[PDB]
Amino acid sequence: VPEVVVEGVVFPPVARPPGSAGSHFLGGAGVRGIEIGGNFIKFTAIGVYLEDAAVSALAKKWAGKTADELASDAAFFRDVVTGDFEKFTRVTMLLPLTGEQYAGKVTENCVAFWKAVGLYTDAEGVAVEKFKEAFKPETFPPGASILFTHSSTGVLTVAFSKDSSVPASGGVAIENKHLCEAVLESIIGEHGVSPAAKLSLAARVSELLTK
Ligand SMILES: O=C1C[C@@H](c2ccc(O)cc2)Oc2cc(O)ccc21
Ligand SMILES: O=C1C[C@@H](c2ccc(O)cc2)Oc2cc(O)ccc21
């Protein structure tokens, strides 16, 4: 597949996460903004990479479905988020943000959505602290990156980079499945904070489930 660029940030078509040797391809890459008044104001550039073994797993169900057929099924996005494979996500800052300020928003969409469904156990609470701790001493000038590694077993790994480059040596590893998927679920889920990314991951992945 081809490279996807999001507002200058250049997400290459393949990438090996920090601490991994397998190859991941780029599922999709879109912008995240919020609605200041009435304007779409861009803050981050997100890319979602999926392990190569993922094409087989998803194709079991989604082969031959159009880009819009895939783009409209919340299952295609739940499958990806919770797929029994590895997922690598890079968040690149278009606007300046601080780790303390990034992690807060992510956890309040989670530790809230878990209280909406009664799944905010001492697990989530502990995972979100270790989460909110890895981000606290960091500030992300535009160009820096946040790199999450989602494992098949639900093990989140939080690396950082000064630029769009994925570092060689890994980061922290929060050993909780919900918080792992919550992070990804919050980017390309039903309430995904990046529908552009969903659009890219729907278009690209549809052209691979026909080959
Ligand atoms: O205007 C914003 C930006 C937003 C924000 C910070 C970081 C990030 O990554 C994405 C959004 O913080 C907010 C919180 C709010 O309740 C309402 C508006 C905003
Ligand atoms: O690149 C994008 C994402 C795109 C988008 C928004 C919402 C949605 O549901 C699907 C796509 O909207 C935008 C609006 C803008 O002014 C600038 C960039 C974009």
Numbering used by the authors: 3 to 213
Could you share sentences copied from the article?
Chalcone synthase (CHS) and chalcone isomerase (CHI) catalyze the first two committed steps of the flavonoid pathway that plays a pivotal role in the growth and reproduction of land plants, including UV protection, pigmentation, symbiotic nitrogen fixation, and pathogen resistance. Based on the obtained X-ray crystal structures of CHS, CHI, and chalcone isomerase-like protein (CHIL) from the same monocotyledon, Panicum virgatum, along with the results of the steady-state kinetics, spectroscopic/thermodynamic analyses, intermolecular interactions, and their effect on each catalytic step are proposed. The production of these value-added products also offers the prospect of increasing the value of the crop, especially because many of these compounds are soluble and readily extracted. This study characterized the enzymes involved in the first two committed steps of the flavonoid pathway, CHS and CHI, and the non-catalytic protein CHIL. Through crystal structure, molecular docking, mutagenesis, kinetic analyses, ITC, and FRET analysis, our study provides evidence supporting a revised catalytic reaction mechanism for monocot CHS and CHI and identified an intermolecular interaction of CHS with both CHI and CHIL in a non-competitive manner.
